[PDB]
Structures are given as C-alpha cells and as structure tokens.
C-alpha cells in the first residue's frame, strides 16, 4: 500500500502464506475451523521470527571471527513493548506480510493488537534502554543488553470509581515466541555466607546458591542484516535446595522470587532486600558471562575488549563484583584490578531528586553480600586518601565525598561508588549534565573533571516514526527519499517545503487521519466520545509531583470557569488527555489521578460546555498506547519545574510526530527549542535561575493565592467540594500541599502557563500557520535520534566506531 | 536393522534428515558447530512430533463427527516415562529415524537417554493409567486421560552413605516438546466460601477462584493412526488475585502451589489440605470440560455419551461434584441427578491395606468444600435408608456402611462414597476382587451384588516388549509374524517351539545380550562391576513392608552364611539386585534401603565369596530404568504376603521378558501360575487361608526364631552389629519389628522361601531346561496384555465396542 513498508513480491507473498499455514498446522496444532484469533497471531509471529534465525546466527558468528570490542548495556529495565511490527519494519517485511495475511482473509492490524507488551520497565529509563538496543544494532555495534526476565512486568492499570487499581501483568501466560531459552549457559549466583581470610586471600564461603538461566531475544538492526542479543536472566532453585519433603519443594519459590516482579517505583528509592537481591543477581550472572566470553577469545586487555555501561546506579554492584572476581578468584593485585575496573565501567545518571538516589543500609549489605561490603570499604579508603591529598585539610569535603554516609543508619551512596569506579560519568541532557557538575557532584567534578560528560537522550525513529506513523513517514519519503530513517538529520531538507502548499496540506491531512483513527479507538475499546476537530492537548508520562500534571489540572479548571462565566463567547475547542501510571505506594500521585477523573466528571457532563472542552484520563498508558496517542497529538505538555526533568524522551516523540510543544526550559526541552528556534516553541515559566532565586527568598504559595483571583476561585472550588459533592473534603491533601508544602512551585508558573496556553489557542485558529510551525519542528528533530546519541557514546565513551554497512543476507 | 522396527525407505530417510536440520536451525537456533547433545535430542523430538499432528487433528475431528460414547479416565497419577521411542514405535518410524540420524553422524540411542521421564506417578497405579491410555488408543476408543500437570514429579533418589536422599524432579526445566498448552480452555475452580439457601435452591458463594489451564499430550495407538489426548491441568492465579503490591504478586504462589508437586506416598494416606485441593482441582476442571463437550454435541442421555472411570478414591469428589452441577446449576431434581451420576461413574479399587484408605476429616471438607459436605450427608442419608429397608433392625450394619465414620474426629470414608455412587466397582486381580466381596466391602456386596466385578490388570506389550526388548520381539516375529503385538494371545503359538533347538538357542542368546548390555550400563554410569554369567535375581518395586524386600534380605544373608561355612563348595553364582524408592516419611522403608546397602558392603568385599554373590541396590528406579533391567532379569521376585498385593504389574513385565518367577500366591501371581502351569512357576509360602489361620491363633515370631538355627544366626548378626560395625545398634528397629510387631509374617515364609530358592538354583544349572520353562512362560503371557484388560472394561463397564480398524493416514 505505502512505499516505506517495503516490497510485496509474488515469491515472498507465496512463501509467507505457505509458512503461515505450516505453523498453524505443525506448531499450533490447529486448522482454519477451530483457530482462534490468538492462534493466527502466533502463526504470524512464528512465520516472521523464522526470518531472524539465519541473520542472528551469522551476526554472532561474525563477532566471534572478527573479535570486536563488546558493549554490555546493564539495566534493570528494558521497556520493549510489542515485537511483531518492529521486526517486520527492520526486515522490510511489512507489506509482504500485510498482503499474505490479506490473501488468507485476515487483518494484520487486528492480529498485531493481540500481542502483549513486554512491559519490563517503568518509564523513560526503561524505554531509553530499548531505543538504545535498536540504535546499537542499526549502527552495527557488537552490543548486548543484559537484564532480568521478570515474570510480571509493570502492572496493568484499571480505573475504578476514578481510582487507580493495579493488576498483575501476566505477560508470559500464553508463551513468548520472541525468546529462546539457553539452559546450557545457566550460571550460579551466591548470597549470604561469610568471609574467611587464608594465607592467600579472602574466601567467600557458606553461601546460598540461586541459578541464573538466560533467555535470548533478538534485536534486529534496520535493514542491515545485523541481529544483536538481549539476554535476560531468570532465577531457578538448585535441585537439592532445602533438601518435610513437600514443604522443601514448595519453598523453592523463595529463591525463584528474585525474578518474579518489576519494582514499580519511578524516581523513588525503597531499600527492600528483594530489590537488592535483584540488583546483585543481574550483575553476578552478567559478569560471569562477560568473563567467559572474554576468555574464549591476561586481564590487561580486558578494557580493550569490554565496555560495561551502567544504566543508573541499579547495577552499581558490577564495580565491587568485578574487583571481587579479579582479586579473589583471578589473583590480580588490587591496583591492577582497580585500573581494569575503572577503564571498563561507565555510569549514566538519570535524576537529581534526592529521594530517588540509592543509599543502601550497611546492615543489609553486611548480611547479604559480606565480601562486597569489605571491598566497598577498601575502595572508599583509597578514594578518600586521594581526596585528602588533593585538598589537604578540607575535612568537610572528605565527609561529603565518602561512599559511606554516617548517621542513624550507616548507608552506602551508590552514586559515589559509580563515580569513583567509572572512567566516564554522563548526564542525559545538556542542562542536566551542567547541574551535575555545578551541584550534586560538584566535589567529584573538581577532583576528576575529565570524567564528566553529556550525552543528550534520543528516541529511535524506527518505532517512533515509521512504525507508529507510516502516513507521516510516507509523505516525507515522497519528497526526500528513505535515507532519513537511519540518518534523521536529513529531515532538515524539509525546511525547503515550509512554503510548499502541497506539503502543508499533506502534513495536516496525516494529522487529521491519525486523530480520526484515535477517536475511533477510544469509542470502540472504551465507549468514550470525542470531537476530532478539537485541539488534542496531551500529557502522557508517569504521575509525579515534579511533572506537574497538577499545573495542567489548574489550566483545565481555568478554561471551564471562563466558559461558565461567558458561555456564549467563542473558544478553541480542546480535548485534554492525561495519562500515566502512579507508583502503587505514592499517595499524592493516586490523588492526582482521582482529581483528573473528578474534573472530567464535572466538565464532560455540563450542557453549557457542549463539545468545547473534554477531559479524558487515558487508562493503562504503556508503549503500545504511546504508539497510538502520540501520532494523534496536537499539543505536547512538557511542564516539569525547571531543573527536575533530567531529559525527558516523550517530548522528542511528540516533536517527531507533528505536535507543537508547550514546555518549561527543562531537560531536553532546552535543546529542542534551540534546534527548532524559540519562535517555534511555546516556552513559559521560571528558568532554573529563577527557581534558585525563589528558594533563597523562600517560596510562599499564599502570595500567588492572594494576588490571582482566578487561582483563588479554583482553590475555593477544590476545598468546598465542587469537584466531589458526596465527599466535600476529598481533595484537602492536594490543597494543603499546594498551599504549604509544594516542592515544585505549581502556583509560581500558573499565570505564565495560562497566558502561554492562550497563545497556543490563537495559533490553532490559523491552520496554515499552525502547520508551518509543525513543519519547522519535524524538520529540526534530527538531533534527537538515538542513532546520534549512540554514535556519541561509541566515540566518546566506549572507544568503538559505528558502521552503517550491511552484513551479507 | 531388525524387522519389527519398520521400513527405512529412501524418501522417508531423506525427509527425516531435512526436517531434523530445519528444526536444528529454525527451532533450536543452532548450527552443527555449537549444537549440544540436548539440542540434537530436541531436533529429533520436534521431527517426530511433526508426524503426530495430522493424525491428532483428524482423530479428534472423527470423534466430533461420529459422536461416540466418550471414556474419561480420571487419575491423580500418569506414570508415562519417556515419549520419543514410544512415539516412533507406534508410528513405525524407528528404523527410518535410526537410519536418518546415523547418516547425520549421530547415535539415536544416545539421544534417547537425554529425555527426562515424565514421572507423574508413584508406582503401579500410575503406570497402570499409562498402559491403559496406550491400549485405549490401540483399541480405537474415544478416550481421554485427565490429571494434573505436576511441576515436580516423583523425586530423584540419590543414595548417600547407604541412605536415601531425595531431590526435586525438575522435569520441565528444558521444556516439554510433547505438550501443547490450550489457554482457550482455561476454566475456573472454586474453593472455600459458604452455602446460601434461596427460594430456588442452594448457592455456593464468596469463594476463592483458582484457574485451571489445560495442556494436551498425544497418545498414539499402535499403527492404527489413532491419536488420543491426555489433558493435564495446571493451576494459575487470576490477575486481580490478592489485588502491599509486591507481596500480593508474590502470594500468587499460594494458589499455584496446587499443581506444584506429586505426593510421594504409595499405599498410605496423609490427610493434608494441599492433597485435598489437588483432588478437587482435577475433578472440578475435568467435569466442566466434560459437560462443555457434551453440550456441544437433556441429561437423560448423559450416561449414553459419557463414562467416568475413577482410578481409586483419589478423584471420588467427582460424585458429589456431578450432583452439585446437576442439582444446583442445571436444576435437575435429586433423584434424576443421582440416576445420571450412578450410571456415569465407575470405581476401581487398588488396595486392601486400611492405612491406605482415604478418610477425610469432616472439618477439612466443611471449610474447603461446604456444599460438597452437604451433598455427601444427603447421599449418606438416602443410602442408609436403603440399607435399613433391606436389612431391617440391623443397626450395626448401618454404622459399618455409613459414609460418615464416627469417633474422635468425624471422617468421610471415600471408598463407601465411591461404591454408593458408582454402577460398577472392580478389583484388579481375581483374588483381590474376591477379597473385596468377602471382607472389606462384604456389606456392600450383600446389598448390591451386581455392582461388583473383576478386571485383572495388564501391561502394554508395546512399551514392555517391542520398545524395551527388540531382540526378543524380533525372534518371536521371525516364527509367528507381527500380529501378536496387538493381539498378545497369539504368543500361545510359541508352545510349538518348546522343543525347537534353534528357538531355544535364540531365546537364551537374547537374554545373554540383554544381560551384557545391562552389565555395561552399570559399569559406565555407576562404576559397579558384575558377573554377567551369574543368575540375575531382581526385585524392583516401591519399598514397603508388605512387599517383603526384608524376606529377600534374609535369603541373601543365608546364602552368604552358607558360603562362609563351606567356602569350597560349588554354588550357582547370583547377582541379587534390589531397587525402589521409599516414601520420604516412611522410616522403616528407609531403614530397609540402608540394610540392603549394608549387606552389599559386607558381601561385595569378602575375598572368600569371590564372584559367587553380589548384592546391588539399583538407585533411582523409575520407568526408564525398568525398561533396562527387566529385559536383563532371570528371576523375578514377587514375594508379598498372601492377600496384600492387589495385583502387581511388575510381575507381568518380567514374565513377558523371559524371567522365571519366584512368588507367593498373591494378586495376579495366582493367574500367572494358572496360565503357565504351576510346574513352570516357583511358588512358595502361605496361601491367604494359611495367613487367616495364623492370625486366629496369633502370630508368634519367636517360635520360628527358636526352631530355625539359620534364622537365629541372621538375627544375632543383625543385633550384634555384624552389618554395621561402627554403629552396633543401627538395625535394632528392624530386629524389634521382626520379633514383636511384624504385620507381614516374614519369618513364617522364610523356610519355604529358602527351599524354593534352592530349586531355582538347581534348574539354572541346566540351561536348556531353564530356557524351555522360560518359553512356556512367554508363550502363556497373552492374558496379561492391557489390550485384554481394556476390552473387558469397554464391554462390561463402559458399554462400548473396541475396534482394531485403521483410520485413514
Ligand atoms: O514459545 C514457547 C517457547 O518458545 C521457546 N523457543 C523455542 S523452542 N525456539 N525459539 C526459537 C526462536 C527463533 C527466532 C527468534 F527470533 C526467537 C526464538 C522458548 O525457549 C520458551 O521459553 C517459550 O516458552
Ligand atoms: O534518561 C531517561 C529518563 O530517565 C528518567 N528516570 C527514570 S524513569 N528513573 N527511574 C528510576 C527508578 C528508580 C527505582 C525503580 F525501582 C525504578 C526506576 C528521567 O526522569 C527522565 O528525565 C529521562 O528522560
Ligand atoms: O517446548 C516448548 C513449549 O512447546 C509448546 N508447544 C507448542 S508451541 N506446540 N506444540 C505442538 C505439538 C505438536 C505435536 C505434539 F505431539 C505435541 C505438541 C507448549 O505449549 C509449551 O508448554 C512448551 O513449553
Ligand atoms: O492396580 C495397579 C496397582 O495399584 C497399586 N496401588 C498403588 S501404587 N497405590 N497407590 C496409592 C497411593 C495413595 C496415596 C498417594 F499419595 C499416592 C498413591 C497396588 O498396590 C498394586 O497391587 C496394583 O498392581
């Protein structure tokens, strides 16, 4: 149907049809009379996966023969979403499969909706890992993602009576056709025990053993025949475990609980033993696998052949684990082992919020990982000796920089461990990396300035344009060809079409089609009715106070109050959509969801409002939902308090897909506005500097309440029970926080936000000028490809050159 | 190589080779350079399973179109063993696969050893279910086996320091290629809750729900293109289960524990809640599936279309569950529902030992299954009213026959429930069925004599001759053709060859080859050395006092003592092999294993004994081990106290494979001796009548100790520490039991057993006459085919005719 989806040749279509029928019969044990829609999905998935096999085997054989430097990306999260369409896109099979299934009397898009998301992450950090794997494969790097195969991913969100309910994401229930179990590479992982000192060094003894069994998932590059591996570990008890009899077998569950469930905290730290076990489990298994692969090729050459990237501090135990193996098992001297470790490891930081930082109680590490605690103490002593030598007499620097935090309970600061033990430390957007050098890691930057880098985040244009928005991809390819898909900078060529009447019309038509499709998806699966001619105002991301869904709520209520005051005045119609999950133990975030639905309950049923304003909470926001809503959006809400969102990546997805952005100068928003031009961005609010000035003076919310009548009215409505008639004081916690304990200064940006929103509405009244500004955004979105990000990691951190060359088919 | 293994045509071999390579590549994601032996096994298993698919789909479609009466065999145990060779045998693919793998440079026998046993049973009862499924498929019956898919089967036995250790049988670790998950037939099962009475009947409410997910395994008939189904249920928590958050997800394990592990008791009853849950789980899920299939075709016709066979009392809850569904859900009146239930259900009893009988405490059923308890009370009331009418004034009969047992804790006698609610009750050998009518169910037989039947057990000659003993199968087929494999009575034709010199030589040669092969298996996998010219004296079966492994031990010690007394006298050399698992909580059985190994420790290292006597404990006795040892045996030990072994089936396996039997007149031994002739059997010991006479007088072990000097010496050796020098009193429990508390009268059969064993040795000195007696045993083993057994169930209980006709290929 459309060109970027590839060729549908007669031989290909015929062979796909034959192989689909073969799998239905031999694999699924069905014929056409009894086959369920799920059966059809599986037949297609097996048919497509067959095409990966040859390329997967030869890619891995190629790395064995050429022995390049290997990149190991360690993460506790890989937020992959669905795999079927992505595989078809990267193999150029989409049109062929569409034709083949059509001839079999099946709708492929219907089949695609059957696949479960692999929801093995919470939000931005997990999705970043996934975009990175795509880009590393596309850039021909010998890269492996290593993580945990959680039996349960991020919970499915249900909304009951306006409240979030959580249910188990049993994503493996029907079996996962995209994985291959690798039982021959099963490895032991040790816990507890004690340290013995012998004539020739320490020994870690009397440990409990849990087995780590790997499952491999293919990561195909974009039409280059490269297929890399994501290896995820599953926990298994040994067979003599606990070995009255019945109970011993039942207790195997205790060991296997390690890989049972993803912790659902986003930017928040809970010091639970199970989480610590998960972190060590992935690190211990991964490092053994890395060492094994390195020997099957003298640890001096280790950093020349191995790079380990730590995705936040979650896998920080790789640093003392590597030291443990090198010193205790391989018998290297300390200083050489340390040199190897530092040159091998690099660390990426993803947040500056203090409550999100991992600080593990010493008593936990003492019991669970006694040898690692000893190694950490020794690292700290040697590091602090370096600090004392560089800054003689500066005793407070010594306590600030210590890996060991003193107080009620002694804790290990894992970020300090990561900096000390890594040759490179990076933030994820220019402003974030600057904040790290100026504030939270200032002392470290002064000691070792060469370690600190920036690597601005990106997203893959395969999933986030070609896959989710084929209509846009096609009209772009019509003018500039297909090369931009793996070289996104080529989108600059579209600046030549900003006055092109045909292109303006096509861009606007593609958006309308996406909006119509999304309006249809809402009616069918949720029975909610929306005006597709309204401005689609979208804020989708995890629920957090810093992200300020509450500021958006205040704007929504402002618009409602203005309409009620002057009902017969024209306003640009809006559909305001807010979606995102709240961490199950985060009370304020759960109250915010309830507020949003409560506002919708009033606004959506007011006859005077009509079709001019609707507020919809998008339930169960996840990767597959993002693929649907993002192409449909007109306005992207990126409204975090300046200095709080390290980068953001949702922002980049909206930019690439033809939405304009309303945002603060925070995270990557700054660089997006720089690329597009400030005139083509809706910027409002305090800058980082203004926030600093306010903190020095002291933030007084009452001042804003006293000076802004429209704000006072909203607070009075919330307090009095206007939005909760049966429970008048339902939102008292929200009001109290806004008035007395607001870390994120919601009121301080209110006036500027409302005014800026008026300017958005003004521009939307002029469709032609709205679309020209859109074209200017899409055209300058190139920098935000994760291909650019990964090429920078490769050159500036890992010491490897990317390659756009094909492997033989 | 040999004829009964089928044809190896050029087209077949070529296609097998191509498909093997295809699976190695696409399914296993390997090439020949990295492939492990396990990879090769899996490639072959997938290659073979492909051949089942068409036949499986058409068999099930045939049953749908013809709508025959369906047979449902309900069992908590299916002891299947390995599936690869069995599938090849039944599809006539063995020679073709052997040739195909040979041309690929692989040894198929080596590949076969990689497969895990499906050890989903304990012993005879579980293995009977498996032979029955084979025979039902071979006889073209529309039959389904229904059970539980245990994650852990019967434990693997390790012997450490002469003691049994248990380890978890993680048989699914690498994945099971012989099953297909059927998630679309997932059904809810209810537990706990309470009963509410409304205007129109009882309602079971406030229950907890566990999901039952089915997995289907094919059961191929012998070369008739029939493939039946064994459907096994796995327990799964619903997604909102327990739905702080982390713990709720972790607690899903509680629901899923239902299908985690097989209870390892053999002929012993433990009233544990988890076991009760397993029993209801299989019954509730199975009955819903049965009803669903019946409707997709007025409950008057239910018994015309459905038969349910209860394998012991373990699935006895089918009776009140069927009533529950018919009365509470379908709204049938009681008397009609009862009529349907009785005509649908039949019950097979497998033991007379009182400690093995299921008697569930009322308080357990009250909490777990409140509605079922009420239904059971109502069944009991109506049944006892019938008894009172038939036997007026017989108040003690009333309490004897009650389903409710009075006392300390009230219990439900599940055997009484089964008799009351079944149209047919059978024992499993003629003597056993007679004992049921005369003793434990005498009252029931008097009330309803027409219900009581005999169905003597059998074994499948596919697994237990063709598969495990191809050499014997071949020399038989040379003389009489191949028809006997599905018509075992044809073996009578071999009586014509009892004086045939060529046949005598061939029978003896096949045995020698099997013995040499088994002697080689022992050296390689266990480093134990045996004389292959010795008489192979084998007792393999679960360890139990009633089976009298202890009597065998006394004989072994007798032989050792005789040798030590007259070292230079000739004796027929023996290798005495004993194997079997002990239930983990059965102390005396564990002590018996230790005794056996302790005897071996003395006998096997005595220089004076030489190669004349060896005692070996066969570790981890299971189906795949039985397939190896049984063909190698010369003497089958079947020495249970008369009246205690209901049938035995190991006995039949040895008879079919050319061993002579030493045995008591117990279980099926009686019928075996009747078929072969008493002259061709080594019968010794008390008959049932003699045991009865001894019990009336009182059994005094001391009498035997006082009158038999050889017995006194053995007891003195055991007591003094001759067999345990470092722990002199190790065996005091054994001695004390033999002297004061022996329910099974070991001493009473000692003298006769030893004398009989002397006659065995005498015959073995004359190889030609030994072999002629063997031929007379093999020739009369026909009756003991499970094809005969199943044809009798079909005609006399189920009301269906077996068919030897082929379905189209
Ligand atoms: O789908 C059911 C089972 O599938 C198994 N995969 C097997 S047998 N081959 N895969 C081959 C493969 C080929 C190409 C791919 F791109 C990925 C996998 C998995 O090991 C198992 O964990 C899973 O439950
Ligand atoms: O760099 C990628 C993105 O990283 C995000 N961090 C996230 S999701 N941290 N989760 C931390 C976490 C902590 C404990 C957990 F149990 C789970 C997750 C940043 O907020 C965002 O600005 C940035 O764009
Ligand atoms: O082997 C890995 C997985 O295999 C799956 N089987 C699939 S995909 N097809 N089987 C088809 C089949 C064909 C012929 C047979 F005689 C049996 C099965 C099972 O459902 C799953 O529980 C198991 O873990
Ligand atoms: O009919 C077949 C065979 O049945 C046997 N019974 C067996 S194995 N009962 N197991 C009972 C059991 C009880 C509780 C459990 F948790 C497990 C098993 C008979 O002893 C044997 O003489 C006969 O040949």
Short mmCIF file of C-alpha atoms in Angstrom, two decimals, chain B residues 429-670:
data_model
loop_
_atom_site.label_atom_id
_atom_site.label_comp_id
_atom_site.label_asym_id
_atom_site.label_seq_id
_atom_site.Cartn_x
_atom_site.Cartn_y
_atom_site.Cartn_z
CA UNK B 429 -6.98 -59.36 40.04
CA UNK B 430 -9.29 -62.33 40.66
CA UNK B 431 -8.09 -62.98 44.26
CA UNK B 432 -8.26 -59.25 45.11
CA UNK B 433 -11.82 -58.90 43.72
CA UNK B 434 -12.83 -61.96 45.79
CA UNK B 435 -11.28 -60.45 48.94
CA UNK B 436 -13.32 -57.24 48.37
CA UNK B 437 -16.58 -59.26 48.25
CA UNK B 438 -15.65 -61.48 51.21
CA UNK B 439 -14.09 -58.95 53.59
CA UNK B 440 -13.76 -55.14 53.38
CA UNK B 441 -16.83 -54.47 51.18
CA UNK B 442 -18.83 -57.56 52.21
CA UNK B 443 -21.82 -55.45 53.42
CA UNK B 444 -21.94 -53.55 50.11
CA UNK B 445 -21.74 -56.74 48.07
CA UNK B 446 -24.73 -58.12 50.02
CA UNK B 447 -26.79 -55.01 49.24
CA UNK B 448 -25.86 -54.66 45.56
CA UNK B 449 -24.08 -57.80 44.28
CA UNK B 450 -24.43 -56.77 40.60
CA UNK B 451 -22.02 -53.83 41.08
CA UNK B 452 -19.00 -55.99 41.92
CA UNK B 453 -16.66 -57.07 39.14
CA UNK B 454 -13.12 -58.20 38.45
CA UNK B 455 -10.79 -56.69 35.84
CA UNK B 456 -7.37 -58.33 36.07
CA UNK B 457 -4.55 -55.86 35.37
CA UNK B 458 -2.32 -55.91 32.30
CA UNK B 459 0.66 -54.13 30.75
CA UNK B 460 1.12 -52.79 27.24
CA UNK B 461 3.23 -55.07 25.05
CA UNK B 462 4.35 -52.03 23.01
CA UNK B 463 6.42 -50.41 25.77
CA UNK B 464 7.05 -53.64 27.69
CA UNK B 465 8.23 -55.87 24.84
CA UNK B 466 8.74 -54.14 21.46
CA UNK B 467 10.28 -50.96 22.89
CA UNK B 468 12.41 -52.38 25.70
CA UNK B 469 13.25 -55.79 24.23
CA UNK B 470 13.50 -55.55 20.40
CA UNK B 471 15.77 -58.64 20.27
CA UNK B 472 13.06 -60.80 21.84
CA UNK B 473 10.29 -59.19 19.76
CA UNK B 474 12.26 -59.98 16.59
CA UNK B 475 12.96 -63.69 17.25
CA UNK B 476 9.27 -64.11 18.07
CA UNK B 477 8.17 -62.27 14.91
CA UNK B 478 10.53 -64.48 12.84
CA UNK B 479 8.42 -67.54 13.70
CA UNK B 480 4.88 -66.19 14.17
CA UNK B 481 4.73 -62.84 12.35
CA UNK B 482 3.95 -59.39 13.77
CA UNK B 483 0.24 -59.69 14.63
CA UNK B 484 0.93 -60.65 18.25
CA UNK B 485 1.98 -57.07 19.11
CA UNK B 486 -1.68 -56.01 19.18
CA UNK B 487 -3.08 -59.48 19.82
CA UNK B 488 -0.85 -60.92 22.54
CA UNK B 489 -2.82 -64.22 22.81
CA UNK B 490 -1.02 -65.24 19.62
CA UNK B 491 2.07 -65.93 21.76
CA UNK B 492 0.45 -69.34 22.52
CA UNK B 493 1.77 -70.37 19.08
CA UNK B 494 5.24 -70.43 20.67
CA UNK B 495 4.32 -73.61 22.59
CA UNK B 496 5.04 -75.35 19.24
CA UNK B 497 8.69 -74.30 19.57
CA UNK B 498 9.40 -75.54 23.10
CA UNK B 499 11.44 -78.45 21.64
CA UNK B 500 12.85 -76.38 18.74
CA UNK B 501 16.63 -76.31 19.14
CA UNK B 502 17.09 -73.11 17.10
CA UNK B 503 14.45 -71.22 19.13
CA UNK B 504 15.87 -72.43 22.48
CA UNK B 505 19.30 -71.10 21.44
CA UNK B 506 17.88 -67.76 20.22
CA UNK B 507 15.82 -67.16 23.39
CA UNK B 508 18.90 -67.84 25.54
CA UNK B 509 21.11 -65.67 23.30
CA UNK B 510 18.71 -62.69 23.53
CA UNK B 511 18.78 -62.91 27.34
CA UNK B 512 22.60 -63.05 27.40
CA UNK B 513 22.81 -59.97 25.13
CA UNK B 514 20.39 -58.05 27.40
CA UNK B 515 22.41 -59.06 30.47
CA UNK B 516 25.68 -57.98 28.81
CA UNK B 517 24.15 -54.61 27.83
CA UNK B 518 22.86 -54.07 31.39
CA UNK B 519 26.23 -55.07 32.91
CA UNK B 520 27.81 -52.43 30.64
CA UNK B 521 25.24 -49.79 31.66
CA UNK B 522 26.11 -50.44 35.31
CA UNK B 523 29.89 -50.05 34.83
CA UNK B 524 29.63 -46.87 32.72
CA UNK B 525 27.05 -44.87 34.70
CA UNK B 526 27.74 -46.25 38.20
CA UNK B 527 31.25 -47.84 38.23
CA UNK B 528 29.86 -51.12 39.61
CA UNK B 529 31.23 -54.44 38.31
CA UNK B 530 29.12 -57.59 37.92
CA UNK B 531 29.50 -61.15 36.62
CA UNK B 532 27.23 -61.43 33.51
CA UNK B 533 27.28 -65.23 33.79
CA UNK B 534 25.56 -65.15 37.18
CA UNK B 535 21.82 -65.57 37.73
CA UNK B 536 20.26 -62.07 37.72
CA UNK B 537 17.93 -62.11 40.75
CA UNK B 538 15.81 -58.94 40.62
CA UNK B 539 13.30 -57.30 42.97
CA UNK B 540 12.28 -53.84 41.74
CA UNK B 541 9.20 -52.04 43.12
CA UNK B 542 8.50 -49.36 45.74
CA UNK B 543 9.88 -50.19 49.21
CA UNK B 544 7.15 -51.43 51.55
CA UNK B 545 6.92 -53.85 54.43
CA UNK B 546 4.15 -55.81 52.68
CA UNK B 547 6.31 -56.36 49.58
CA UNK B 548 8.88 -58.03 51.85
CA UNK B 549 12.21 -56.81 50.48
CA UNK B 550 13.18 -57.93 54.02
CA UNK B 551 12.43 -61.58 53.21
CA UNK B 552 14.77 -61.24 50.20
CA UNK B 553 17.45 -59.74 52.52
CA UNK B 554 17.18 -62.78 54.82
CA UNK B 555 17.73 -65.09 51.86
CA UNK B 556 20.77 -63.09 50.74
CA UNK B 557 22.34 -63.33 54.23
CA UNK B 558 21.52 -67.07 54.34
CA UNK B 559 23.48 -67.59 51.09
CA UNK B 560 26.41 -65.57 52.40
CA UNK B 561 26.48 -67.55 55.67
CA UNK B 562 26.35 -70.88 53.81
CA UNK B 563 29.27 -69.83 51.59
CA UNK B 564 31.29 -68.74 54.62
CA UNK B 565 30.60 -72.09 56.32
CA UNK B 566 31.63 -74.21 53.30
CA UNK B 567 33.76 -71.88 51.13
CA UNK B 568 34.97 -74.59 48.73
CA UNK B 569 31.55 -75.99 47.83
CA UNK B 570 30.08 -75.03 44.43
CA UNK B 571 27.09 -72.67 44.36
CA UNK B 572 25.27 -71.15 41.39
CA UNK B 573 26.58 -67.55 41.21
CA UNK B 574 23.96 -64.81 41.70
CA UNK B 575 23.71 -61.12 41.23
CA UNK B 576 20.96 -60.01 43.58
CA UNK B 577 19.55 -56.64 42.55
CA UNK B 578 17.05 -54.72 44.68
CA UNK B 579 15.70 -51.31 43.75
CA UNK B 580 12.83 -48.97 44.56
CA UNK B 581 12.02 -45.67 46.20
CA UNK B 582 10.82 -45.22 49.75
CA UNK B 583 8.15 -42.66 50.66
CA UNK B 584 10.14 -39.81 52.32
CA UNK B 585 8.27 -40.08 55.66
CA UNK B 586 8.30 -43.89 55.89
CA UNK B 587 11.04 -44.63 58.42
CA UNK B 588 11.03 -48.44 58.22
CA UNK B 589 11.30 -48.32 54.39
CA UNK B 590 14.31 -46.04 54.67
CA UNK B 591 15.91 -48.46 57.15
CA UNK B 592 15.34 -51.34 54.70
CA UNK B 593 17.28 -49.48 51.97
CA UNK B 594 20.12 -48.92 54.46
CA UNK B 595 20.08 -52.65 55.35
CA UNK B 596 20.35 -53.66 51.67
CA UNK B 597 23.35 -51.38 51.08
CA UNK B 598 24.92 -52.54 54.38
CA UNK B 599 24.63 -56.19 53.28
CA UNK B 600 26.27 -55.26 49.94
CA UNK B 601 29.10 -53.53 51.85
CA UNK B 602 29.95 -56.83 53.60
CA UNK B 603 29.19 -59.34 50.82
CA UNK B 604 30.75 -57.47 47.88
CA UNK B 605 34.16 -57.08 49.55
CA UNK B 606 34.58 -60.53 51.11
CA UNK B 607 37.50 -62.22 49.26
CA UNK B 608 36.21 -65.72 50.08
CA UNK B 609 32.86 -65.03 48.36
CA UNK B 610 34.60 -64.01 45.13
CA UNK B 611 32.28 -63.56 42.17
CA UNK B 612 29.72 -66.02 43.53
CA UNK B 613 27.46 -63.46 45.23
CA UNK B 614 26.94 -59.74 44.68
CA UNK B 615 24.23 -57.51 46.16
CA UNK B 616 23.48 -54.27 44.33
CA UNK B 617 20.95 -51.57 45.20
CA UNK B 618 19.56 -50.13 41.96
CA UNK B 619 19.40 -46.38 42.51
CA UNK B 620 16.51 -44.22 41.23
CA UNK B 621 14.19 -46.99 40.00
CA UNK B 622 11.78 -45.42 37.52
CA UNK B 623 10.12 -46.29 34.17
CA UNK B 624 13.24 -45.75 32.03
CA UNK B 625 15.30 -47.92 34.43
CA UNK B 626 12.62 -50.66 34.37
CA UNK B 627 12.95 -50.74 30.56
CA UNK B 628 16.63 -51.64 31.00
CA UNK B 629 16.67 -54.03 33.96
CA UNK B 630 13.52 -56.09 33.22
CA UNK B 631 14.84 -57.47 29.86
CA UNK B 632 18.05 -58.48 31.68
CA UNK B 633 16.43 -60.39 34.58
CA UNK B 634 16.50 -64.17 35.06
CA UNK B 635 14.45 -64.36 38.27
CA UNK B 636 11.51 -62.10 39.20
CA UNK B 637 10.90 -61.70 42.96
CA UNK B 638 7.19 -61.35 43.70
CA UNK B 639 7.08 -62.23 47.36
CA UNK B 640 4.37 -60.14 49.04
CA UNK B 641 2.50 -61.76 51.98
CA UNK B 642 -0.57 -63.55 50.55
CA UNK B 643 -3.56 -61.14 50.49
CA UNK B 644 -1.60 -57.88 50.39
CA UNK B 645 -0.58 -57.15 46.78
CA UNK B 646 -3.88 -56.39 44.99
CA UNK B 647 -2.44 -57.36 41.59
CA UNK B 648 1.12 -56.32 40.83
CA UNK B 649 2.13 -55.40 37.28
CA UNK B 650 5.93 -55.63 37.53
CA UNK B 651 5.26 -59.38 37.71
CA UNK B 652 3.71 -59.37 34.21
CA UNK B 653 6.59 -57.32 32.73
CA UNK B 654 9.16 -59.91 33.87
CA UNK B 655 7.03 -62.81 32.56
CA UNK B 656 6.80 -61.21 29.09
CA UNK B 657 10.57 -60.64 29.00
CA UNK B 658 11.90 -64.13 29.76
CA UNK B 659 12.42 -64.22 33.53
CA UNK B 660 11.07 -67.05 35.69
CA UNK B 661 9.04 -66.03 38.78
CA UNK B 662 9.51 -66.88 42.45
CA UNK B 663 6.36 -65.80 44.22
CA UNK B 664 3.57 -66.25 46.69
CA UNK B 665 0.00 -66.99 45.62
CA UNK B 666 -0.88 -63.30 45.81
CA UNK B 667 -2.51 -60.82 43.40
CA UNK B 668 -2.05 -61.66 39.72
CA UNK B 669 0.70 -64.22 40.56
CA UNK B 670 -2.20 -66.68 41.01
#
